[PDB]
Every structure is written in structure tokens, then in C-alpha cells.
Point group: D3
Chain length 270, copies 6
Amino acid sequence: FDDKILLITGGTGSFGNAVMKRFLDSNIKEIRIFSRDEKKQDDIRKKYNNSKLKFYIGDVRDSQSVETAMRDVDYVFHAAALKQVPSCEFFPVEAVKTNIIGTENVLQSAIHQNVKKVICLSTDKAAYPINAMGISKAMMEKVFVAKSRNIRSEQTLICGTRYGNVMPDMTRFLMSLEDAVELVVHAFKHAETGDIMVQKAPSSTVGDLATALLAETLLTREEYAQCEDMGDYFRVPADSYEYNSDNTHILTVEEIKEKLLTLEYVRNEL
Amino acid sequence: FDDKILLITGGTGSFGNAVMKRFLDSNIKEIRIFSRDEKKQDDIRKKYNNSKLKFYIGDVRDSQSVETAMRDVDYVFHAAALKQVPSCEFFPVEAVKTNIIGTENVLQSAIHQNVKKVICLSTDKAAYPINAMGISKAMMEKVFVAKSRNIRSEQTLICGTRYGNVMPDMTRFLMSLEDAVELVVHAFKHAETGDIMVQKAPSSTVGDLATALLAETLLTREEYAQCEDMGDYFRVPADSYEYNSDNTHILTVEEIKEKLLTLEYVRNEL
Amino acid sequence: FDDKILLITGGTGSFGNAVMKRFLDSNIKEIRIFSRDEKKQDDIRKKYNNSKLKFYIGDVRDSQSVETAMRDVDYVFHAAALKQVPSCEFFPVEAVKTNIIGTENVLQSAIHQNVKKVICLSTDKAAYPINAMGISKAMMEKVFVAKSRNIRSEQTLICGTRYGNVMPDMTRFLMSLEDAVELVVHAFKHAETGDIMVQKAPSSTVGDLATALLAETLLTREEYAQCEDMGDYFRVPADSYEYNSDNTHILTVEEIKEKLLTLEYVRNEL
Amino acid sequence: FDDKILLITGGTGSFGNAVMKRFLDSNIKEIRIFSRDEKKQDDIRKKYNNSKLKFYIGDVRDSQSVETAMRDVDYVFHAAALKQVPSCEFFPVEAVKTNIIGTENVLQSAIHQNVKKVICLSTDKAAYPINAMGISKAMMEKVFVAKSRNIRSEQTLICGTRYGNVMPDMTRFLMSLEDAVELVVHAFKHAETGDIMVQKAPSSTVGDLATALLAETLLTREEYAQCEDMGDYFRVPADSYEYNSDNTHILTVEEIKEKLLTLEYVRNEL
Amino acid sequence: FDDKILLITGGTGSFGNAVMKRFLDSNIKEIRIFSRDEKKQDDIRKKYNNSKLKFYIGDVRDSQSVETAMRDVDYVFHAAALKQVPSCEFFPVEAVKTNIIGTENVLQSAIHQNVKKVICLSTDKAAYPINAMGISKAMMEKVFVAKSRNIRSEQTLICGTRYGNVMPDMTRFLMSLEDAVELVVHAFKHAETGDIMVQKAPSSTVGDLATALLAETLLTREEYAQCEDMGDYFRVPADSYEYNSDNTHILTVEEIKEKLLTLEYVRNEL
Amino acid sequence: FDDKILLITGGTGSFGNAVMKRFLDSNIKEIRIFSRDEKKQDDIRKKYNNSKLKFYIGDVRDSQSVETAMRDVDYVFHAAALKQVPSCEFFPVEAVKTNIIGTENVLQSAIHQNVKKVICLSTDKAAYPINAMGISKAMMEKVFVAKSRNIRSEQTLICGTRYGNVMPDMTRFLMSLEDAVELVVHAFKHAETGDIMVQKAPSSTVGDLATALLAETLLTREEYAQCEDMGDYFRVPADSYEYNSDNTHILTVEEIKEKLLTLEYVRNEL
Ligand SMILES: NC(=O)c1ccc[n+]([C@@H]2O[C@H](COP(=O)([O-])OP(=O)(O)OC[C@H]3O[C@@H](n4cnc5c(N)ncnc54)[C@H](OP(=O)(O)O)[C@@H]3O)[C@@H](O)[C@H]2O)c1
Ligand SMILES: NC(=O)c1ccc[n+]([C@@H]2O[C@H](COP(=O)([O-])OP(=O)(O)OC[C@H]3O[C@@H](n4cnc5c(N)ncnc54)[C@H](OP(=O)(O)O)[C@@H]3O)[C@@H](O)[C@H]2O)c1
Ligand SMILES: NC(=O)c1ccc[n+]([C@@H]2O[C@H](COP(=O)([O-])OP(=O)(O)OC[C@H]3O[C@@H](n4cnc5c(N)ncnc54)[C@H](OP(=O)(O)O)[C@@H]3O)[C@@H](O)[C@H]2O)c1
Ligand SMILES: NC(=O)c1ccc[n+]([C@@H]2O[C@H](COP(=O)([O-])OP(=O)(O)OC[C@H]3O[C@@H](n4cnc5c(N)ncnc54)[C@H](OP(=O)(O)O)[C@@H]3O)[C@@H](O)[C@H]2O)c1
Ligand SMILES: NC(=O)c1ccc[n+]([C@@H]2O[C@H](COP(=O)([O-])OP(=O)(O)OC[C@H]3O[C@@H](n4cnc5c(N)ncnc54)[C@H](OP(=O)(O)O)[C@@H]3O)[C@@H](O)[C@H]2O)c1
Ligand SMILES: NC(=O)c1ccc[n+]([C@@H]2O[C@H](COP(=O)([O-])OP(=O)(O)OC[C@H]3O[C@@H](n4cnc5c(N)ncnc54)[C@H](OP(=O)(O)O)[C@@H]3O)[C@@H](O)[C@H]2O)c1
């Protein structure tokens, strides 16, 4: 990060911001926020009042606007997506345009600009997808994986990261926004080209959650078979029973309540 | 089919040909075979020696070549795909270009030409896909489904059909090529706009198959929940445990051998 | 508005929302909100809880996504723009892509769908522009004006509306958001094809404004020459000293304070 | 100009030719004339009978034809435009395609080919534009200015030049074609990346002109504020009362007549 | 021609003008001149001073600019081409873009606008072509011919016209500009969809020509075989020894001199 | 061929395969087969069972799929075409898309990837073409020839090869598939940039052929004039009576029968 330039596509999102407040008071050269929305960008600019933040208008659908932003960049965190389920169900083609083709553009541009590392953000919904958001995401995973095979890593390294949700008796994964940034920083440092990184996470029942108030699949069977264990993460390396919310360290109110406390968002009656 | 024109995209395939030998000696006006390959087209033309067969060079990636072929058509059987697994795994983007965007083009063109019915051919691999072929297919299903919502049916009716394979102890579905045409003819007649039709099929263990020589999922849990039963077919209608090869009428050698006999292909030592 | 369908491109904006809360409890058939951002769209959907609101994902840069949304629409309020000054100064091409070409797409699509009336929202900055936002806006005005000449009005009527800002001794125009909707409703009813409508508005000095706390050009000289007076609006009809903030009814604290009161936004210490 | 290659887009114009007869008997390597019209190109080729002149068919709307011409070029004088007022008023989009997007293509191609300097020819009409020609030109100025910020100058230097007209009591600027080439040669040598250069020019009243037979704005107020004085030129450098024809050295018949004499065009009754 | 609208693409050319001075003092509704060059268009506009002449900026490479011009047109004379030999030899792709794809655009647009008749101007060089101009022209002939098969004539009729040159012992065809317009008017009236019309023309030796100062192939062998004779024209109708300058009525000085006289161009020492 | 990579576009064809069985048991690094059809590719893969064979899905119409395949390639044999006559006659535009534009893409991509040599396969039908296949081929020849002028050879060398047919009294050329590979290997080694190579070949009468069972033009007059003789080949170098089947070594049954024998295809009653 000594004089290094980071580009975050979809930089104005929940995640882009979390990577920001993290990376900012650091000694990285420049953090390029790249997205469509001048309003969110304007809100970010004013508050942080920090010169390392560069704002780029553009969208991942358009190769020429990606290139401009991509010039002389070292690391890309590709977070730009259509990520809501109904919006993708009614407009699957838009899901395609952004999630899949948007990713081809980011990758081609990255390679052309001799970017060192690209990390594509993905979702547990891509593991056995049933909805268009998840499906398009699965397809984005295959896309970056195929690209990684063809590209020498010392030129450009290309990897991805699935996560479940951040921030009645059935179960769901528990990740904070702080936890999400971690997975990516982890991928940055340790991923080899083609890898999908997934964070090991506690997974509360949705019923026991609502009490602390005063099944999600992260790896397909086949992915768990092929994978590699890194401690708090599995690593699915590119080729050439299952990891889900019902079978990690499941928690009860006693623990559900504690993790909540740390969300600087939830602890708000001040 | 009185003076009706049928267009088959990917008309030169295993299926296109099966629909052909079926529909030909009929009284349909014209059967438009639309595909990329002049060689296969040439082989078809010579043999059948039948005036109702019209050959169109074009590909589904290209809207202008679709339109030409689409002019004054009544029914489309959309069979054009990249359907092999490794080829889609190494070239997912091509899978996207053909399977998903190819389908947007066919649909837009169909609608513009006031086509009456479009049937998109799909695959059991689209149900909980893990591979890019299947994934892109799943995405194609969402695409035609989304399009069907926005389009009045009396303008253009849009439906699809999944099938397993045609022609060690684990199980797999058994459909002939004759069985495959049936499913489509069925969809033609009875599908409402947005439907996915799936044929009920016997499903032998792969081990007991190889003996007659002298798990596949067709519906996701959620799809089986929502579906409607038509006898030899389920119907999944558009919104706004599972049906698989391990739990249909499973067969043993006695029955496996008999079905084989009818394949005009297998019974060949003449 | 009896069974009439309205489409608002950039429907998620300050203005789109103002037109919404206005048109909603009415008897219009359907109000299509068309924009890029699923998050804003999601926030709107939840709150209003109103069936006439239809949400369309798409962007004006893309003709195919415009068409989908444009199907069977009667009236379009074209509000989609890159409207901040610095963002347009650093990324003029994006300004071009959205403000000018976005507008060609909306117009072509409108015409093709036999839309009855399209209203393009514009800005005082388009009158003698010096910045890229204003310049691109000026260009958008010429674009819709040129299109209006070529199109019979009984097919599709095409007009636009400039306004100054809504919501030290130099002067600036004073329009509320309520005032802005008015101008558009006015254009809807009374504009002929090609017209630019501009609202007559009081124009306080920025110095006397900040006191009530307890030059903008709307028409170029040449435009004032050619224009037509409608009472609270000027009408600039298509061809084949100046109207500015220093010379309307200028106001002092006594009046500045009163208009403020009505902004349901400013009167907030509750 | 020792073995240097110059490309003139719109090379067949009034200006392209003036730069030609100037640069020709020099020792520059090659002067590439790039334009759409084979007829004008053919007329030029025949007459000059000079090997340094290379003729390229292409147009600035098309990136692939720009690249071909752009290969191994050192300096570009970008003169290709739709420059007549009514033609731009009726066909603003064409104005956009050529003047603005044509310029993005030329710039991108220039950069890719590691061109040393690009000079975009502009017009006084871009200063407070009211017409589409002027507006599109203003937009072209912002476009090249934005591009210059993002590009290191030692890679590719990007600048522009406004001029009034060349060759009843109100006033207008007086530049010859010889004067116009000068401004560009000046920009070539002295412009820094992002600069707009404007020539200081005498400005006769149109009434006193017609007698020698035997208001134009070059800088907006704001541009005059920010500018830098170079003697016979102002320099407007890129960010991060007015200069007009009514207030330069205005001339009377005595001087109007003399300047005329030098136009090798006007002195023609031979 | 009662209230009929004619569009001439490449309307600013030698031919466009000849069709103009012909059709003008008539009672046709509107003659749309469509081309790239505002300068030629401006020169035409001023001189003829005639309201039936409408000037359209656009180029045939661009479908959207064709459509605008094509709206409500009855007859198209497609004369837009890259027609010089060396320019096509060095830039064959441009030849392709204009001559072949330009023609696909004109045809598609014509059909969409329910144009009654389109006439594509072609050249003797398309008969056994050896150069890129001729080759691209040959290809344009096949293109319009293929399109004519697929299109019902009562919708849109599509035909073409080859001619040799207008205005040492080897031979060449002799057509005036007046003769060229004739061939087209002839095609307009009598061509069936798919026809190539060729004018029968006297063909002087180039040696005997230069004396009156005080081999070209129009039909390939195969084309002469298939053709139909109409008096002063052959008609080559669409499928599903040779006609050349060495064997028409060849002329000697006595006749060469006389035909010359009529060229209002040659008889100029006044 | 020491660690050299060969790409064959249209690699699945009659020719692609002939170049394969030739080059395979060699010591070349990698032979990239690039084409549209996964089925043919799959058939090739299985049989040869040889690691040097790499299979790429893509088509020449699409630049992005060409680039992927083109990365780090040393030699390209461009064999991808629409080569049947009727298919090109009915769909000339497809002929254009593949044969001409497909070739521009392959060339641009080749150059960008710093490919050493590209050989475009052509046909005797391009010499005085009368059909769209031949015409489009002629145009492809001009296209690669034009490109070769603009490109330094030490960067990328670009050449082509015409051949007649491989494998009543009128005559036709006789080349085997083995003969066809030869011509290309010859071009590989000896062609200079811009050359068209043509093989000297015996040319039997079609009547005397059918007896051994127990006019084609390769160079236009003008091409024979300009050409250079290399023994068993003519070489047509780029600029800045005829060679045909009726006048090579014509053969009678005695020789016709013998050449046949060697076709490992014809000698099949085993
Ligand atoms: N619950 C979760 O947070 C969660 C769970 C699993 C996976 N993920 C994955 O993590 C990634 C980012 O998540 P998030 O929490 O940051 O979502 P988010 O807050 O909605 O951020 C997405 C950002 O993408 C931008 N964007 C959308 N389309 C774009 C385009 N075409 N070009 C450029 N930018 C575009 C949007 O900015 P503009 O509107 O300004 O363009 C938005 O700020 C997603 O890909 C998602 O699949 C998230
Ligand atoms: N085992 C099975 O047969 C099976 C099982 C499940 C589902 N399905 C589904 O049924 C459909 C058709 O199956 P099939 O047995 O006919 O496969 P197939 O025999 O490979 O037929 C596919 C045809 O599509 C054509 N095609 C490919 N890309 C095209 C493009 N871009 N434009 C136009 N045509 C194109 C090909 O013809 P050209 O090469 O001539 O263009 C080919 O003949 C597929 O979508 C598949 O997913 C099949
Ligand atoms: N101060 C003012 O309010 C003011 C003054 C003068 C003139 N105007 C004019 O009035 C118009 C609208 O003003 P506003 O107050 O509503 O601004 P706004 O609140 O920023 O609304 C603009 C909307 O456009 C949408 N949008 C942007 N790019 C788009 C694209 N490519 N496709 C589809 N939608 C897109 C955005 O939604 P998504 O991000 O969801 O796509 C945004 O909600 C503007 O054109 C402006 O020039 C406004
Ligand atoms: N009165 C003046 O002369 C004056 C005053 C102020 C500013 N300027 C500026 O100076 C510049 C050039 O002026 P000028 O006097 O040379 O005008 P001009 O004589 O009309 O020259 C413009 C040239 O541009 C070429 N062109 C147009 N569109 C093109 C395209 N898409 N691709 C490639 N070439 C194209 C035309 O050549 P083809 O038709 O052969 O393509 C034409 O020869 C203009 O940008 C103008 O704004 C001129
Ligand atoms: N000697 C002859 O005259 C002769 C002989 C045989 C055949 N022909 C055929 O007759 C046709 C016309 O001949 P002509 O004598 O009129 O040639 P011309 O005088 O050069 O006319 C061609 C016109 O086409 C226009 N043009 C070129 N590219 C264009 C584009 N992309 N979009 C729109 N317009 C375009 C040009 O106008 P702008 O520059 O204003 O766009 C030009 O005025 C040609 O197709 C030619 O093959 C002519
Ligand atoms: N009789 C002859 O053999 C003969 C005579 C004279 C000249 N030639 C020339 O030699 C060349 C090759 O001849 P051939 O005998 O190999 O013909 P072929 O056997 O038909 O081979 C052509 C190959 O091109 C591929 N192809 C077609 N369109 C493509 C596209 N858009 N992208 C990528 N690949 C594409 C096809 O593969 P997919 O279907 O898998 O894409 C096909 O295997 C041709 O250009 C032809 O003009 C041949």
C-alpha cells in the first residue's frame, strides 16, 4: 500500500464504505471510488474530507468509463452489482449486464492496465442458486475463474469472495460489515489466482435471534470436497458434505446478544 | 399448422432434426432451420429433399440475422445453445453470449414479428446448477420468464422445457429423442405464458443400465412445491420435496433393456 | 389520467418523488418509476405501499431497457440526469452519455411506443452555459427540439422545462419542490411540441436569504425576444433583454421568511 | 518536425489546407490528411504533387479508422467538425457524434498511439453558446480538458484553440486563414496540457467593413478572470470583464481596407 | 410523384444533382438530400432556392441517421458510395462500411419505413471485379438482391442499376449524366424487385475520342445468358457471350464529336 | 516451432484437421483450435488424445473472443469462413460478417498480440468472382493486403493463399488436402507481407475424371502479369494472359487414376 492505488467499483455501497473507513487513516496512495451515483459520491466526499479519496463517475457496463478509472491502479475490489433479489427476478437482463458482463469489463480493463490483483465480491446465494441474483452471481464466479486460467498471475491475479448476509427455526449466517472487509483483506493477501475464499462464520437460528432484543449454503457439497482449509476460511481453488448455516458453530441468545452489541448500528438509542 | 411457419433456432442439432422428421410429412407451411453451420444445413437439405424445409444462415448472437429469419414466423422452437459442460466451463462468456443474450435476441425478435408462441429448450442442469452450462441455462429460464410477464400472451406466448439426458449405483433420467419432441409438442399446445414444462420420466441407475447389454434433479424443492401436475408432466407457472432421478419410477434391467430396443440407433448391428 | 400510464425516468430523484406524492392518491392507472438504483427503488416501494407504483430497473443509456419500460406508456417525464456540476466537469463524457444520448434513447423509444407526451426536465444553467452540466443540458434542449420538428405532435409531443434551484449581494431564483412539479404539470397540459416552458419565480439576494433564520439566467436575451407570455410562465416555441434573478420580483427578509415556512423540510425542529 | 508525422483530421477543410501549404516545403516527415471525402482528397493529391502528403480515408466517428491513421503519429491537429450553424440546429445529434464523440475517439486513439501533442480546433461560439454548433463545441472543450487532467503530459499533451471568423453597427473579429494557422502553431509550441489558446485580434464593425469596397465573445467573463496573457494570445489553463469584438482594437475603413489587401482571395479581379 | 417524397442518399454528388435539376420543376412533394457534407449541402441549398429541397445531415453507416431521413419517404435513390478506385484499394474496410453495410442500413430502414421503391446505383466495375471499389460494389449487388427475395415487393421493391463512366486502341462506354438519370428513372418505373438494369450505350475507343478535339464489361457472360432485353436496356432478374465496350455500336470521330457537343460542360470556352 | 504456438481459426474444418495431423507429432508447443462448434471440437479432442491441442470456443465475428485465443500466439492460419456458394448467395451479409469483417478482427487482434505471421486462406473463386462467396473472398484478399501495407512485417507479417477445389468437357483444378497444407506451409516459410501464394496444379477435364472409376481461374490476367514464379507456386506481391484450369498440365485418365489412388478417402472399399 506504499504509494499503491486501490479502485473500488460500486465504491458507494455498504461494503465500499466499510473498506474505506478501514483503509483511510492508512498510508495507501489513493482510493478510487467508482460508481454511477453522483449523490452518494457527493455525500462521501464532504464527510471524510480526505485527499486520498478520488471520485470517479462511471459504470461497469461501459468499458471506456472503466478504463479511465482503471489507469495506473494496483488493486481492484469489484463490488459493483445488482444485488437485490426481486429486482433481479423482474429484470434478469440487467442482472446480466452488471453482474456478469460488468465483470468481464472490469477484468479486461484490469488486465489491460496491468492491475496486480482483482477481488470479485460474491454471495452465498451463488451456491446452488435458485434466484436470478444468485444465478447471475454464480455465473460471475465462473467468469472470473475462467479468466484467471488464461491470465498469468504475475500479470494480474483474479479471485473472489462469497459471503452470507451482513448486519422460524431455520438458520442463517452471521457476519458483520467488519467481518466482510476482513474476508476481502484476507483474499488480497493470500488468495491465489482463481480462488474463491469463504469466511467461516457462526450461524444462528432466525428464531433465537429475535429473542436477543431486551438454510444458507456457503459451499456446495462438491465445493466442500475440493476445498482447502485455512482456519477461519475455506479456499476453493480453480479446477484445471456441504458447508451451511445449519452446521457451523450454531449459537444461542447468550452469544447472539453479544455479537449484536458490537454493531455500532444496533447499539443506537442514544 | 395450416399454412403455419415454424422456426427452429439451432435447427441443425440432435433435437432440431427430431422435430423435423416428426413435423415434415405433415401439412405445416414451412419449417425454417436457422443455425450457423452451412455444412450441417447442406447435409440436411440434400437428404430430406422436401420443399417445406427452408434454410437460414444466421446466429442468435446477432439480432439482424434473427429478424430476417423471424419475419412472418408463427412458432419458434428455440434450441440454439452452447450445451457441453467443459466448453462452457472454459468459455463461460460464450455461454453467456449464446444461451442468455442469444435468448434475449430471439425473444425480442419474436415479439417484434408478432410470433405466436416461443418455446425455449432447457435442461435439468438448470435446477440447482453447479456448472456454467447449467448456470447460464438457469439464467436463460429467468430471462424468458421475465419477458413473459411483460408480454401479453395473445401477442406472444413464451415458455420453456427442461429435460435430462436423451439417447455406479447413482441414478439418471431416461428420455429418448422421441420423448424429447413430445415434451415440446406438449408445451406448444398446453403451456401458458411463463411456464416451465418438465416431462415425467423413468430414471434408471447407471449401474443397472450397462447390464442390459447382452442424481439428476428436474425440479428444485421450491419448484416442486409451486408446481402443477398434468399427468406425464409437471408445470411450473411463473411467480407474479424435490423431483429427481433417485425417486421416480426407477427401473431394473428387465425394463431398461426394453426401452433401449426402440432406439433406432442402439439396435444397429445390421 | 383515466387508465393512463406515466413513466418517470430518474424516478427515484428529488423530483420523481415530488411528482409521485402528487399523482398518487389520484386515479391514474400506473406510475412507472424507471432508474438504475434498486436501493432507492426499494425504499420508495416499502413506504408508499401503493399498487399504482411500478418499479423498473434500467438506465437511459441503454435502449433495450428503455423500451421495456416504455411499452404502453402514455406520458413520460424525463428527469434522468447527471446534474451535479463538478461530477460533470471531471466526467463530461458521462454527462454526454446520460444527458444527451440518454435523451435520444428516451425520445426514440417514446416515439416507437407511440407515447403521447414527453417532458424533458432542464435547468437555468442551460441558458448561456459555462459548465459541462449546463452545456450538456443546453445540448439536450436542442436535441429534443430537433426531434420535435421531425415528429408529428398527434403522434408524440415533445417539450421541456427549465428551472433554477429548488429547496453575497448577488441573486438567485426561488422555487420549491411543489413549484417544480407545477411547471411540469403545466407543460403536460399546455405545451405545444418543441416548447421550452420556464416558470416565473421570485428571486431573492443570497445575502437577504441567510438573514431569515431567526445572477441566475432563466432565459437568454434571444430567448426572451422570441418568447410568449402565459402569466406565471414564459413559453419559448421552436424556431422553424434577458430574464434573470436580478430582475424579477426580488424579495426581502419579510417575504423570504414566509416562503421558507411552507417547506415541510425547513420547518423541522420537532 | 525532423522525421515527425503530423495528422490532420478533417484535413480537407479550409484550415487543413492552410496548415498544409504552410508545413509542406518544410522538412517534416509526413503530413497525414484524414477525412471522409475521397473527392476533396483527390483534388488535393493531384495539385500539390508532394510525397510527404499521405491520404487516409476514415471518419472520427469510427475508432478503428482513427487508429489506423493514428499509428506512429507525433502531432494531431484535430480540425474535423460539423461547423455550420443551421445543419447543427436541425441535426444536433450529428453535431454530437462528430464534435464531441468524434473528439473522444481522436483523444483515446492519440493516447493509445502515444501521440505527443493533440490540438483541438474550437470557436468563439463555444463561449456562452446559444446554438448547437457552439454548444457541441463548448462540450468538446470540456471533453478535451477533462481528458488532459487524467493524462500525464509527457505521454500525451492535449490542448485547444478558439477562433472567431476567418476570411449593422455591431462588431465581429477579424482573422485571416494565415492568422488561424499561427494560433495553432503557437499552441503546438507553447500550450501546456489543458490550455485553451485564443488569439488577440482586431475587431471591426460589420458596417465599416462593407465600406472598404472601392458582438463576438472569445472569452467569457470567468475565462478572462482565470486567464493568462501571452502578448498576442490569452491562455486559459485548466482548473484543477469579458473579451469580445466590441472591445479590442476596433478599426475603421483605413485599416479594414489594408488587411483585406493581403487576402490572396479578395484581391482577385485579375 | 403527386405528394411523393424522394430521398437521395449521397444526394450531393454528380448524380444526386442530375436527378435534382431533373425532378425539381416537377410536382413531386419533397426531395430529401441526405449526405455527410454540410458544405456541399449549403452550396446546393443557396443556388436552387426551391422549397421542395430538404437537406438532411446523416451518413449511411449510421442506422439512426438513416431512419430520421427515411421517415415517410416513398422512393429512395441510393447513390451514397466510396467510388474511387485507389481510395478503396488502400481503405477496403471503409469501402465495406459504406458500400455494403451502408446499403444494408438503407435497405433495413427503407423496409421499416414501408418505402415503396429503392434503387441502388452500381457500376460496370462490379462485373468481374478486380479492384476493391468494384468488388465491394459487386457485394452490394448481391446484398440488395438477397434482400429483395425476402421482401414482398408490394411492401418494398428493391432494384439496382449498373453504369459505366459518365461525362490506346481499347474501348470504353459513353454515357452522359443525362443518360445516367434516365437509367434510374427507367428502373423506377419498370424494374421488378431484384432486377439489375443496365443501359445499352455506344462505346468509343479511347484513341478515337481524343481526336474529336478540334474493355469495359457491363454484363458478365453468365449475366448476358440470364438477361432480358428491353430495347435500350438489359434486365437481369434475380435467380430464385458478354456485354462489353468492344462490342456495342462502336463509334468514330464523326459521332464521338456530336455526342460531346451536348455536354453543357464540354462546350465551355464562353 | 520450438515452443511456438499456432492458432487455427475455423480449426474444425477439412483444412484445420489436415494441418493438425501434419503438425501434431512434431515439436510445436501448442496448436490452438478456434471455432464456434463444441461438437466438432469434442470429436477432435477425444480422438487425437494429444496435449498440444488446445480448444478454444469463439467466433471471428467477435473481437473479444478472438483476443483471448490470440494471446501469446506466434502464427495464425486463418481458415474460418462461410465457404458454400448458395448459403452465401442467400445470406451475403453473413458472408460479409465472417469472411471480411471476421478477417478484420483476426488481423487487428493478431497485430495487437504481436503475432509473427498470419496466413489467410482464400479461393480461386476470388479471381473474377461472380458469386457472393467468391466476391466476399476477393474482398477479404484486398482487406488483408491493405492491412499488410500499414503494418511493418517484423511486427506482423500478413499473407494469403488461393486454392481451387480439393478432394462435361470443361476443366477444373486438382489439389488434394495434402496439397492444400503444403501451399500454406509454403506461405508460412516464404511469403513476404502482402503476398498471395497460389499453387501450380494439374487440371483435369471433369469428363475424363469420371472415367477413372474402374474453367477455374487461379490468377486473373492482371495478376499473372504482376506475378513472380517460384517453381510450383506463383507469388502475387502487393502493389505499392491468365492462369486457369484449361491451360496447366492437363491430364488424361492414365494420370487422373493415379493421383486418386493416394486419397486415403477414395481408396475405401475395405
Ligand atoms: N448483505 C450484503 O451486504 C451482501 C451479502 C452477500 C454478498 N454481498 C456482495 O458484496 C457486493 C457489494 O455489497 P454491498 O453491501 O456494498 O452492496 P451495496 O451497498 O448495494 O453496494 C453496491 C454498490 O454497487 C454500485 N453499483 C451498482 N451498479 C453499478 C455499475 N453498473 N457500475 C458501477 N457501480 C455500480 C452501487 O453504487 P452506485 O449506485 O453509486 O453506482 C452500490 O453502491 C455485492 O456484489 C454483493 O453481491 C453483499
Ligand atoms: N442431451 C440432450 O440432448 C439435452 C439434454 C438436456 C437439454 N437439452 C437442451 O435442448 C437444446 C437443444 O439440444 P440438442 O440435442 O439439439 O443439442 P445440439 O444437437 O447440440 O443442437 C444445438 C444446435 O444449436 C445450434 N447453435 C449453436 N449456437 C448457435 C447460435 N449462436 N445461433 C444459431 N444456432 C446455434 C447448433 O447448430 P449450428 O452449429 O449449425 O449453429 C446445434 O445444431 C439445448 O439448448 C439443450 O440445452 C439437450
Ligand atoms: N435543484 C434541482 O433540483 C434542479 C434544478 C434545475 C434543474 N433540475 C433538473 O430536473 C431534473 C431532475 O432533478 P432532481 O431534483 O430529480 O435530481 P435528482 O434528485 O438527482 O434525480 C435524478 C434521478 O435521475 C436518476 N438517473 C440518473 N442517471 C440515470 C440513468 N442513466 N438512467 C435512469 N435514471 C437515472 C437517478 O436515479 P438512479 O440513481 O436511481 O438511477 C436520480 O434519482 C434534472 O435533469 C435536473 O437537470 C433540477
Ligand atoms: N470560419 C472558420 O473557418 C472557423 C471559425 C471558428 C472556428 N473554426 C474551427 O476550426 C475547425 C476547422 O475549420 P475549417 O475552416 O477547416 O472548416 P472546414 O473547412 O469545413 O473543415 C472541416 C473538415 O472536417 C472534415 N470532417 C468533417 N466531419 C468529419 C469526420 N467525421 N471525420 C473526419 N473528417 C471530417 C471535412 O472533411 P471531409 O468532408 O473530407 O471529411 C472538412 O474538410 C472547425 O472545428 C471549426 O469549429 C473555424
Ligand atoms: N462515373 C460515375 O459517375 C459513375 C460510374 C459508374 C457508377 N457510378 C455509381 O453511381 C453512384 C453515385 O455516383 P456519383 O457520380 O453521384 O458519385 P459522387 O458524385 O461521388 O456522389 C456520391 C455521393 O455520396 C455521398 N456519400 C458518400 N459516403 C456517404 C455516406 N456514408 N453517407 C451518405 N452519403 C455519402 C457523397 O456526399 P457527401 O460527401 O456529402 O456525404 C457524394 O456526394 C455511385 O454509387 C457509383 O458507384 C458512378
Ligand atoms: N474445397 C475446399 O476445401 C476449398 C477450396 C478453395 C478454398 N478453400 C478455403 O480454405 C478455407 C478453409 O477451408 P476448409 O476446407 O477447412 O472449409 P471447412 O472444412 O468448412 O472449414 C471452415 C471452418 O471454419 C469454421 N468457422 C466458420 N465460421 C466461423 C467463425 N465465425 N468463427 C470461427 N470459426 C468459423 C468452421 O468451424 P465451426 O463450425 O466449428 O466454427 C469450419 O470448421 C476457407 O476459407 C475456404 O475459402 C477451401
